[PDB]
Amino acid sequence: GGAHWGYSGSIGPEHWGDLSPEYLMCKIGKNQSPIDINSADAVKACLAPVSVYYVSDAKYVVNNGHTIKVVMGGRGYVVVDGKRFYLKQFHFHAPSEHTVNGKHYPFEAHFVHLDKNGNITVLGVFFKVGKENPELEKVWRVMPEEPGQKRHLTARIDPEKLLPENRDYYRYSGSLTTPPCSEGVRWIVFKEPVEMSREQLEKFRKVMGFDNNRPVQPLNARKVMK
Amino acid sequence: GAHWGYSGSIGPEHWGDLSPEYLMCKIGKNQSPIDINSADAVKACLAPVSVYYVSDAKYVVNNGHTIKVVMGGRGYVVVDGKRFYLKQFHFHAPSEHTVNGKHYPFEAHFVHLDKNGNITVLGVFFKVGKENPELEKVWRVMPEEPGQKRHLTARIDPEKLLPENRDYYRYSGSLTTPPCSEGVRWIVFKEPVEMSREQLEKFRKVMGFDNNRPVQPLNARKVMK
Amino acid sequence: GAHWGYSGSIGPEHWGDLSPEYLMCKIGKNQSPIDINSADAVKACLAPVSVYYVSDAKYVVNNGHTIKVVMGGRGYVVVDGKRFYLKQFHFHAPSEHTVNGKHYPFEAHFVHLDKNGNITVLGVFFKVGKENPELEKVWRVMPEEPGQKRHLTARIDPEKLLPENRDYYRYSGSLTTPPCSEGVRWIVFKEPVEMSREQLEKFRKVMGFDNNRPVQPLNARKVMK
Amino acid sequence: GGAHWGYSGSIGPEHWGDLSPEYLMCKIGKNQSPIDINSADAVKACLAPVSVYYVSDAKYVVNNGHTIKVVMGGRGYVVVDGKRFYLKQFHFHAPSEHTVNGKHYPFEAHFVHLDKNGNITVLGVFFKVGKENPELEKVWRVMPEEPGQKRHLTARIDPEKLLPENRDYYRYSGSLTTPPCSEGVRWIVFKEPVEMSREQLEKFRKVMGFDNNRPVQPLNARKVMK
Ligand SMILES: Nc1ccc(S(N)(=O)=O)cc1
Ligand SMILES: Nc1ccc(S(N)(=O)=O)cc1
Ligand SMILES: Nc1ccc(S(N)(=O)=O)cc1
Ligand SMILES: Nc1ccc(S(N)(=O)=O)cc1
Ligand SMILES: [Cl-]
Ligand SMILES: [Cl-]
Ligand SMILES: [Zn+2]
Ligand SMILES: [Zn+2]
Ligand SMILES: [Zn+2]
Ligand SMILES: [Zn+2]
Numbered sequence: 001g002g003a004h005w006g007y008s009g010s011i012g013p014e015h016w017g018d019l020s021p022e023y024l025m026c027k028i029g030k031n032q033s034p035i036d037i038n039s040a041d042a043v044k045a046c047l048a049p050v051s052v053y054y055v056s057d058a059k060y061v062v063n064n065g066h067t068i069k070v071v072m073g074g075r076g077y078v079v080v081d082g083k084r085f086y087l088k089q090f091h092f093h094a095p096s097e098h099t100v101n102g103k104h105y106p107f108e109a110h111f112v113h114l115d116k117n118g119n120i121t122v123l124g125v126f127f128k129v130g131k132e133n134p135e136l137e138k139v140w141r142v143m144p145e146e147p148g149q150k151r152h153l154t155a156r157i158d159p160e161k162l163l164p165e166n167r168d169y170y171r172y173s174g175s176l177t178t179p180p181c182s183e184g185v186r187w188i189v190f191k192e193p194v195e196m197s198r199e200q201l202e203k204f205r206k207v208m209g210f211d212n213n214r215p216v217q218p219l220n221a222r223k224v225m226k
Numbered sequence: 227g228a229h230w231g232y233s234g235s236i237g238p239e240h241w242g243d244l245s246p247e248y249l250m251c252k253i254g255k256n257q258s259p260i261d262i263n264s265a266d267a268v269k270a271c272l273a274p275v276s277v278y279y280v281s282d283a284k285y286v287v288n289n290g291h292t293i294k295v296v297m298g299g300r301g302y303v304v305v306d307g308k309r310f311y312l313k314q315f316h317f318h319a320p321s322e323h324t325v326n327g328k329h330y331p332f333e334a335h336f337v338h339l340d341k342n343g344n345i346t347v348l349g350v351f352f353k354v355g356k357e358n359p360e361l362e363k364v365w366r367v368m369p370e371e372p373g374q375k376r377h378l379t380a381r382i383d384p385e386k387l388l389p390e391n392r393d394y395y396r397y398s399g400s401l402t403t404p405p406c407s408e409g410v411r412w413i414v415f416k417e418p419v420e421m422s423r424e425q426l427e428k429f430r431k432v433m434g435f436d437n438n439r440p441v442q443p444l445n446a447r448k449v450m451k
Numbered sequence: 452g453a454h455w456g457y458s459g460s461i462g463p464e465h466w467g468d469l470s471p472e473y474l475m476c477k478i479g480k481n482q483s484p485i486d487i488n489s490a491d492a493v494k495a496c497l498a499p500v501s502v503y504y505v506s507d508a509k510y511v512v513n514n515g516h517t518i519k520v521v522m523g524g525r526g527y528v529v530v531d532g533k534r535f536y537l538k539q540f541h542f543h544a545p546s547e548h549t550v551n552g553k554h555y556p557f558e559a560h561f562v563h564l565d566k567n568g569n570i571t572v573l574g575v576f577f578k579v580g581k582e583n584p585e586l587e588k589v590w591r592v593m594p595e596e597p598g599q600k601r602h603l604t605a606r607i608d609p610e611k612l613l614p615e616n617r618d619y620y621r622y623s624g625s626l627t628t629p630p631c632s633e634g635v636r637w638i639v640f641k642e643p644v645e646m647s648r649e650q651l652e653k654f655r656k657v658m659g660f661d662n663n664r665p666v667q668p669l670n671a672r673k674v675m676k
Numbered sequence: 677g678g679a680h681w682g683y684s685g686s687i688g689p690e691h692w693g694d695l696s697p698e699y700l701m702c703k704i705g706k707n708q709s710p711i712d713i714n715s716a717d718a719v720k721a722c723l724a725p726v727s728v729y730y731v732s733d734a735k736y737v738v739n740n741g742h743t744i745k746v747v748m749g750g751r752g753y754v755v756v757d758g759k760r761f762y763l764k765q766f767h768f769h770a771p772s773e774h775t776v777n778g779k780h781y782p783f784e785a786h787f788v789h790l791d792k793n794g795n796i797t798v799l800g801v802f803f804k805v806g807k808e809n810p811e812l813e814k815v816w817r818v819m820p821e822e823p824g825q826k827r828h829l830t831a832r833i834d835p836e837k838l839l840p841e842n843r844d845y846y847r848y849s850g851s852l853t854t855p856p857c858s859e860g861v862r863w864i865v866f867k868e869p870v871e872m873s874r875e876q877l878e879k880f881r882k883v884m885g886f887d888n889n890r891p892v893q894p895l896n897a898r899k900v901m902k
Contacts, residue, residue, distance in 0.1 A: 024249075030409030031256045031398065041306075043450060044722065045270035046496040119445070173256060173398065173446040184255030184445040220344070220409040221398035225270065225448065269494055271722040474700075480860030481707045481849060495721035495901065531717075569896070623707065623849065623897035634706030634896040670795070670860040671849040673901065675719060 032217035033174030065147030085113035130195035258399030290372030310338035355420030483624030515597030535563035580645030708893035709850030710773035741823030761789035806871035
């Protein structure tokens with residue numbers, strides 16, 4: 001029900017804040033995502049482990065014209081700030097939205113969670129090119145190739161198998177990276193990348209047809225914790 | 227920007243609607259002040275905040291919202307490796323920030339701007355105790371009427387108002403008065419300094435009302451300690 | 452092991468030479484107690500030390516070196532993921548540890564052993580203030596003569612002696628009495644608890660002398676905070 | 677002037693504490709080195725950067741029958757606990773003395789420093805097999821091949837070039853790893869390894885003729901900071 005937006009032309013990221021009054025934060029926000037994570041500038045901090053309690057409740061995969069998204073049943077959760085944030089969906093960007101020390105990864109997954117009070121936590125996972133990713137291949141095998149199309153998953157999705165083994169992370173306070181770019185979003189960005197094959201990357205690039213990362217936004221007053 | 231205050235239909239709950247320019251007061255999710263729950267704050271390797279103040283006070287002003295000492299902007303603190311220049315300091319009673327749900331009777335804000343206009347506020351809490359000598363210099367020329375500036379009669383050394391121990395809480399927040407712009411660095415010192423009850427009462431009476439904004443939800447933020 | 456004490460030719464400086472068994476008192480480089488300089492201590496992600504004590508006091512003994520409450524060893528704390536069982540607790544005046552070069556008037560040590568004989572000591576500082584109810588139960592049966600045990604007349608709840616805030620300094624050290632064995636985990640709580648001046652004075656008079664070992668050099672160690 | 681010791685037989689590490697009363701700490705010490713560094717058990721902490729102010733004041737290389745050691749003039753220093761510890765010598769062990777998560781590296785360098793008050797700080801650098809190490813090759817080219825022999829260095833030694841680029845470290849309180857195994861030694865163990873070629877490793881192994889690492893010792897009451 002929100003105004004139409006995209007990644008280029010008159011509806012691209014530089015214009016989002018003018019597409020609708022609902023999208024104001026895109027242009028006036030000072031706590032926007034994604035960001036560059038400069039590891040030296042980040043603050044070493046006593047960050048609590050982010051406990052993962054996922055379940056295999058995937059409903060379908062959808063190509064919504066902005067990403068490839070797996071929609072979940074909402075029963076699995078992570079624990080952040082002692083609260084349960086339930087896994088609602090995960091989706092993908094290429095190139096990465098976040099950068100580390102000024103460099104992109106070729107691909108980034110976002111696991112989007114909602115607590116019962118309506119607050120959002122996103123877990124970000126970077127991918128590098130290497131070995132074929134078995135869990136990703138379950139989704140890729142049935143990737144809808146046109147926008148507006150959804151497909152049944154033919155294999156049981158285990159979302160935790162997409163996360164890195166090492167669970168060290170960067171944390172900061174940010175926003176959604178797509179309109180309305182609402183703030184008050186908790187970001188948990190895992191430091192260790194996972195792997196996907198070049199073929200998997202190129203399938204995503206070909207199906208999408210364009211890059212779908214928002215440009216990095218100024219840190220402003222924020223510190224990233226590490 | 228419209229007239230605003232601390233009670234009635236122009237009080238803090240109404241701010242965001244008084245002018246479109248004040249919208250962040252209502253819609254922002256990284257607003258100040260906050261309650262600082264010490265147990266919930268995250269232990270972090272925070273850099274010392276070095277202070278290089280000079281005695282460049284220009285005047286004291288009662289602007290109807292606070293008593294404010296305006297500076298020449300030559301002194302500075304170092305935050306994130308950058309110089310933030312001390313433009314003014316001013317006061318609130320009761321405190322704006324709380325610690326573990328409790329107010330201090332009084333809080334001072336030292337407001338700094340870097341060369342690109344980014345704002346850093348250093349907050350100092352005060353408790354009732356011995357008369358504060360440095361504060362006494364400002365109080366001796368406190369203008370009793372809003373809209374009046376008075377010249378200082380003594381040399382102001384702003385660093386003498388800060389606590390001796392320089393450990394602090396840090397978080398990202400906002401200005402505490404309209405337009406409540408975000409992108410503000412907050413450095414809140416953990417150790418309070420003392421003022422006499424008479425110094426406190428003079429401020430309370432000259433203001434004529436409490437001038438603290440209610441604490442705002444932390445939302446996605448952590449406080450570092 | 453030879454007779455040792457807190458003054459004359461059997462005092463702390465002479466300990467290491469009284470018996471070959473006491474050599475570490477003299478040659479060890481990770482000895483306790485220490486001065487805890489808070490500014491020098493390293494901020495660290497220290498695990499909470501969970502306390503699971505039970506009321507299993509057996510007796511109070513004056514052993515000529517301290518007043519000690521001997522426990523049944525059923526209660527425990529969790530340190531490094533392991534259970535360390537509370538064997539006894541005892542007292543020193545003035546404090547053994549100092550903080551920023553200052554003593555507290557009194558310090559309690561809660562001595563624990565894991566299943567393999569590794570020792571963890573929890574230290575609690577006391578300041579003069581209100582009479583301590585839990586300490587009063589022990590004091591009511593304090594044996595006045597060395598070599599005497601007395602039974603308790605009230606149920607001892609040792610956790611009631613610990614401060615409410617459980618934040619602590621940690622370092623690796625030694626026993627503070629001969630043979631001053633190393634390999635001892637020290638958990639020193641930052642917040643003091645209160646005792647009356649009369650409770651303090653009773654202990655000082657029953658002992659008849661100061662029973663604190665002088666602080667020892669940190670050498671290669673850091674204190675975590 | 678101390679009693680003769682070695683790495684095997686009746687004079688090996690299990691016997692060091694009985695070889696001389698001077699070596700007592702080898703058998704009774706509870707703060708001995710080297711150790712296993714379990715990264716999960718280590719405590720994340722606000723460790724100060726260890727500033728390096730080395731100079732090229734190498735005097736000679738020596739094969740002393742226990743290691744290959746480069747002896748320095750003592751003018752270069754590192755800063756630890758706000759004090760200058762001067763670089764006196766550096767030397768090598770294979771396999772590594774320290775282990776990380778129960779695993780050895782094939783080689784470890786130790787840079788030994790002395791403050792003016794007589795306190796020792798050792799910086800440890802792990803090596804893995806990979807590319808030929810240019811700074812190490814300056815020493816290796818003139819490695820004395822028999823115990824008791826010293827040789828002139830034919831190239832200017834720059835000791836800082838042996839340290840890893842990333843200067844993150846583990847710190848703990850320990851001992852010398854050779855008799856007398858004196859305690860009160862500050863250990864700074866860099867987390868990131870550097871590389872040496874297989875040929876460089878095998879030259880060291882061949883010249884030494886035996887492994888020269890002391891077995892790891894119990895952590896006891898200690899925490900390692902990271
Ligand atoms: N609704 C929504 C959820 C997550 C994101 S993202 N790309 O920031 O994770 C954007 C919109
Ligand atoms: N301009 C301005 C400066 C500082 C503050 S305060 N009250 O947050 O320090 C508010 C407005
Ligand atoms: N055995 C023993 C137990 C504890 C201590 S103390 N004083 O270090 O707690 C000394 C000896
Ligand atoms: N003297 C000496 C210095 C350093 C070491 S070592 N191997 O622990 O660095 C041993 C002895
Ligand atoms: Cl946290
Ligand atoms: Cl340090
Ligand atoms: Zn996304
Ligand atoms: Zn203010
Ligand atoms: Zn004791
Ligand atoms: Zn060595």
